Amino acid sequence: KQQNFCVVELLPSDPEYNTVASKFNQTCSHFRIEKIERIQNPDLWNSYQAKKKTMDAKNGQTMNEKQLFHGTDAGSVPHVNRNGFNRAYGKGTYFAVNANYSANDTYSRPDANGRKHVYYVRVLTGIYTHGNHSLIVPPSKNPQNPTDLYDTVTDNVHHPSLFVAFYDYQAYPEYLITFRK
Ligand SMILES: NC(=O)c1cccc(N)c1
Residues with CB under 6 A from ligand 1: 70-71, 94-96, 101-102, 107, 162
Per-position DSSP letters for 38-93, written without gaps between them: EEE-HHHHHHHHHHHHHHHHHTTT---EEEEEEEE-TTHHHHHHHHSS-----SSE
Strand partners for 130? 154
Residue nearest to atom 8 of ligand 1 (CA): 94
* Resolution expressed in Å: 2.8
Q: Is 171 within 8 Å of 165 (Cβ atoms)?
A: yes
- Strand-pairing partners, residue 35, are 178
Residues in the chain, overall count? 181
Q: Any idea what the CATH number is for the domain that residue 46 is in? A: 3.90.228.10
Q: Which domain holds residue 85?
A: 1-181
DSSP 8-state assignment for residue 176 = E
CA–centroid distance, residue 144 to ligand 1 (Å) = 32
Distance, in Å, from the CA atom of 62 to the CA atom of 68, rounded to the nearest integer, reads: 17
Burial 81-118 (b: 16+ CB within 10 A, else e): bbbbbeeebbebbbbbbbbbbbbeeebbeeeeeebbbb
- Based on the structure, what is the number of domains in the chain? 1
Atom of ligand 1 lying closest to residue 163 CA: 6
